[PDB]
Amino acid sequence: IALKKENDQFLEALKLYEGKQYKKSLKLLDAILKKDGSHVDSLALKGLDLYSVGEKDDAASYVANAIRKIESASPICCHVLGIYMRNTKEYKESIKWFTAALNNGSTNKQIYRDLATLQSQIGDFKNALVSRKKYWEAFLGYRANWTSLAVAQDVNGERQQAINTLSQFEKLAEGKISDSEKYEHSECLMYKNDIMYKAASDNQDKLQNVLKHLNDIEPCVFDKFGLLERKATIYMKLGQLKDASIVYRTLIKRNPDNFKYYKLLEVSLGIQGDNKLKKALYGKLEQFYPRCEPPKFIPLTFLQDKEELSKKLREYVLPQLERGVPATFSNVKPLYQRRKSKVSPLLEKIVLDYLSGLDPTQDPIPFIWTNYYLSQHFLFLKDFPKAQEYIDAALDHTPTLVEFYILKARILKHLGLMDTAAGILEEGRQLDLQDRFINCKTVKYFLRANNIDKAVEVASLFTKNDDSVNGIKDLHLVEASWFIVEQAEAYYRLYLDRKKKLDDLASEQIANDIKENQWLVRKYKGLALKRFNAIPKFYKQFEDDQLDFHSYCMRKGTPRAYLEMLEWGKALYTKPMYVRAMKEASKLYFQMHDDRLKRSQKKKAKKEAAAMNKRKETEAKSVAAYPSDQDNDVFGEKLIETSTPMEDFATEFYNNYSMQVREDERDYILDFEFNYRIGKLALCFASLNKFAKRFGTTSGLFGSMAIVLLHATRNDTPFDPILKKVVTKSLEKNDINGLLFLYRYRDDVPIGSSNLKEMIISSLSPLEPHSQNEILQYYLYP
Amino acid sequence: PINIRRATINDIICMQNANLHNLPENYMMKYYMYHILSWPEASFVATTTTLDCEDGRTIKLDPTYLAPGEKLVGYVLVKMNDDPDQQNEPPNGHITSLSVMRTYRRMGIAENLMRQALFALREVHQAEYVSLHVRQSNRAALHLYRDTLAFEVLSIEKSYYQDGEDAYAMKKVLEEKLEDDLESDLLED
Ligand SMILES: O=P(O)(O)O[C@H]1[C@H](OP(=O)(O)O)[C@@H](OP(=O)(O)O)[C@H](OP(=O)(O)O)[C@@H](OP(=O)(O)O)[C@H]1OP(=O)(O)O
Numbered sequence: 001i002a003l004k005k006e007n008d009q010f011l012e013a014l015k016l017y018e019g020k021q022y023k024k025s026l027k028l029l030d031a032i033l034k035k036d037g038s039h040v041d042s043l044a045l046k047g048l049d050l051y052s053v054g055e056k057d058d059a060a061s062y063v064a065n066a067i068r069k070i071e072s073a074s075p076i077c078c079h080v081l082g083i084y085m086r087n088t089k090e091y092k093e094s095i096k097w098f099t100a101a102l103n104n105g106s107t108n109k110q111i112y113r114d115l116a117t118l119q120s121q122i123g124d125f126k127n128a129l130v131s132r133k134k135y136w137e138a139f140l141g142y143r144a145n146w147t148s149l150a151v152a153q154d155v156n157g158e159r160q161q162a163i164n165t166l167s168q169f170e171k172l173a174e175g176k177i178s179d180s181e182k183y184e185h186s187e188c189l190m191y192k193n194d195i196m197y198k199a200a201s202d203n204q205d206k207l208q209n210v211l212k213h214l215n216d217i218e219p220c221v222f223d224k225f226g227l228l229e230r231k232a233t234i235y236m237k238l239g240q241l242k243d244a245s246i247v248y249r250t251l252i253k254r255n256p257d258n259f260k261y262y263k264l265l266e267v268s269l270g271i272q273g274d275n276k277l278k279k280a281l282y283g284k285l286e287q288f289y290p291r292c293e294p295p296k297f298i299p300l301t302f303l304q305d306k307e308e309l310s311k312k313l314r315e316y317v318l319p320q321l322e323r324g325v326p327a328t329f330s331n332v333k334p335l336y337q338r339r340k341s342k343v344s345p346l347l348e349k350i351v352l353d354y355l356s357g358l359d360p361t362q363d364p365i366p367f368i369w370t371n372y373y374l375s376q377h378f379l380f381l382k383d384f385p386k387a388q389e390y391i392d393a394a395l396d397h398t399p400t401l402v403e404f405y406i407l408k409a410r411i412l413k414h415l416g417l418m419d420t421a422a423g424i425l426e427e428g429r430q431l432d433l434q435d436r437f438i439n440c441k442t443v444k445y446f447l448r449a450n451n452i453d454k455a456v457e458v459a460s461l462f463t464k465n466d467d468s469v470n471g472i473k474d475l476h477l478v479e480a481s482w483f484i485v486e487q488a489e490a491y492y493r494l495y496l497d498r499k500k501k502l503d504d505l506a507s508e509q510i511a512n513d514i515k516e517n518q519w520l521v522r523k524y525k526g527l528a529l530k531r532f533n534a535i536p537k538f539y540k541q542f543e544d545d546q547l548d549f550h551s552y553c554m555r556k557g558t559p560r561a562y563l564e565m566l567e568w569g570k571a572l573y574t575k576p577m578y579v580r581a582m583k584e585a586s587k588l589y590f591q592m593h594d595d596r597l598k599r600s601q602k603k604k605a606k607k608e609a610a611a612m613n614k615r616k617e618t619e620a621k622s623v624a625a626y627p628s629d630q631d632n633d634v635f636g637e638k639l640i641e642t643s644t645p646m647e648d649f650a651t652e653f654y655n656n657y658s659m660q661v662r663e664d665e666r667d668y669i670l671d672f673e674f675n676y677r678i679g680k681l682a683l684c685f686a687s688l689n690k691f692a693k694r695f696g697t698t699s700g701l702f703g704s705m706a707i708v709l710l711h712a713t714r715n716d717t718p719f720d721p722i723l724k725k726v727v728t729k730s731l732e733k734n735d736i737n738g739l740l741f742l743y744r745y746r747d748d749v750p751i752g753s754s755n756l757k758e759m760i761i762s763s764l765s766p767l768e769p770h771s772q773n774e775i776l777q778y779y780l781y782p
Numbered sequence: 783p784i785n786i787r788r789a790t791i792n793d794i795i796c797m798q799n800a801n802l803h804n805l806p807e808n809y810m811m812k813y814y815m816y817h818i819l820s821w822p823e824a825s826f827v828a829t830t831t832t833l834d835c836e837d838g839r840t841i842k843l844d845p846t847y848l849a850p851g852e853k854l855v856g857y858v859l860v861k862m863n864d865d866p867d868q869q870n871e872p873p874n875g876h877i878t879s880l881s882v883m884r885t886y887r888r889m890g891i892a893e894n895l896m897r898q899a900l901f902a903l904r905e906v907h908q909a910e911y912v913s914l915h916v917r918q919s920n921r922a923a924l925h926l927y928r929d930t931l932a933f934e935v936l937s938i939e940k941s942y943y944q945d946g947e948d949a950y951a952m953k954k955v956l957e958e959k960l961e962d963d964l965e966s967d968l969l970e971d
Contacts, residue, residue: 222823222905222906222907224906249964249968250964253964255787255898257785258785258786259785259831259833260787263833269968275836281968285962285968288960293785294783297783298833301834301836304836323888325887325888325889326885326888327784327885327886327887327889331783331784334783334830334838335835337851338832338835338837339835339837342837402884406885435884436803436804437804437883438884440802462806464944478809481799482799485845541811542795542811545815556820558819561791561818561822564790564822565791575795576841576842576843576844576845576847577845579843
């Protein structure tokens, strides 16, 4: 029985691995994999060791081999495999092996915490709870195991159980809370009170109990903000508004710059919808908090009297102009938005008056910043000439302020002059070459101008370039979505442009030029899609970043914040930049679908090959997003040559979004266009329907979709859903947006493409030149 | 106008964006998660706000937007010192980062964010002192932290930042005005 001889050597290899000494552990292992070679334990641990040193491919091979030679295994083998799967983000697989370890008779009860984390990560809390409980039973000593359990119980709806789990520890821990644990205690006291409050619902007696508990724990709760907020809320649900009023006043006093506290105070006093008494309220609060916004500003949202309003508006804006505050207009912009007709003329007169009494020489700060304000004022009102004139005046006086160049650039952007705007920001950048803000603004504008190389070179002034020629890699490294998305939308435009020049080609110079544009169009289509694809990678990483907190939050003692994290994680694929990437990438995927559906020189050629493949090498080093070892497809070639576009879009973008998104934020126009291509014309009727309910059947887009849907009825594709969708019509038997939509399907639906193009170019009159020229250059084109 | 409030994890994506725009010192999301999920009562944000009037309803696909009609203009990212070596040492905090869009200066935002941060450290974590770093050429910050917030310049760290600039390491230990008494009725006359 020399098996004990080899089994002891393995245990040594295991200990060597546990000590983070992989190299050694391998040596001992390779020794066992010579006399035996079919020892599953060593094969597994070898795979794990290989992974730890970066031998990823071979690790997978030894793990694959081990697993193939298993189809049961030793408890340690299953354990070791669980870890490898955890490390390689194979969490469901990890749960299988960690589970098998226990089935095959593992005594290591520490495996339940590993499971609890993994099962939490994949959103399987029903089973996570089972693991939290078993682990809790095996180790009642550590508070983290209690909090873990209460959370699992909380998440599973077992609110009473969660409360009892937290309470239980409190009882055991009475008189044993050292100062270094007071914080975790404070957090668990508030977390419990949270659950009790959730369960209390609108039951008056249950609610009064939660308050009783709140005043019980107050001295040991250090989250005074969180506690007072809870207290106020309970009083409101108890109809004891005077008391709530007191709490809100206390909160306001703690943070008089929080608008929320004020608005809530109004309600507690019953004076909401009573301007006379609100003006009174804020007049008094202004005495207490003279340097805070809410008291000064909130009256500006309701005061109906044109006289008092004008007065209050002046008191708010003019002091800011006098102090040279750049954000003066932005501060009142939401008033321009919600009270445009009432406020803007009052402010126009107010500020125009103010300017007239200013001397450029004696009052230089207020002067230039008053002009600045007015430039934004008229820019907002879409009076660009005046906007230009007032910012011009500011620059005339003082041309050393970065803001004046941004505002100017911004006005030209609205006039549809990207290239020029970019140039103006570039001019301003010289004033503060060490400020990354203006740098980023400049990068963005050059990207809007489709001048990517300039954008990249500017951005690279602030990126950490080490083994690279520019900051493209670091920008991917640090999850800079602002850049990647903007650059992707640039690449797409460059792709459409170069495609035009390629279509505008009709002795051999034309041929050589033809091959060059073909490449660029390919290059840009590929990079546009590859850049958009970087976003879902960022956000899938955000999701994966939760893993360590399933444990860390329990040990640190922040269960409340942890639950919020779970809420955050389940909304990741609804976030703006993500939805933006998805929506914009749909243009590419959808097209790639519609297109996949519709459509001697040896020596010299060898010199031409090594010439174009030599430049491509130089280009790859410049556009490379990820390190060479991690990515071979730098131009997105594989992405664009795909034969499963609609799927890739679903797999990479749409699925995760569609599963997390709230019905009241859903893009039914997108669902429509996605299903229309998937073939599910049933969900198309649902999209148009669900869309019709929220926006009415009068919307031009509502009719556009419908017309494109009617043409679907007859005669495509299977009769069944054609009839179902055809019988569904019982529920329903300008507008540039509508006309532009119908144009996107000028092919599928039979309508005069030329005639429609004319109608769209007539509804453009109103729109600003920026939005105007965007449709004429990229929307409607041959 | 600008609203000031405690931060939650719903802010960190935008917080990362502000940082990426305003500073060369950048961190991965997990580093923000680490802060917000360790000291959930310590960091604050300054945002714009669009109140309903008596007369911007959807979120713009813009990387600074926290919610409809609400975009981040500033933040102060805060932590307690959790180095095991200093585990025995008295509890102290650190300002990992403070950033305010330059277009929103001369409005006391950075100060407001700080005054809350400091109080949060004193109240929630019984912090006995707090410290942070600023570039030597930062005179506005130096002025704010020392002349207004009473920090002291503890050290001058040579070649602290990526571009080789020296930092000022600063630390700080933790009447009859008119104020709400929190009893009397606010409305009268
Ligand atoms: O959306 P962008 O094309 O990137 O432009 C935005 C946009 O301004 P405009 O759409 O009016 O040109 C923002 O306005 P909102 O949509 O958020 O209301 C804005 O923010 P503010 O108007 O509140 O200032 C910001 O301006 P800025 O960053 O200077 O404050 C400005 O970006 P650009 O100035 O870079 O064009």
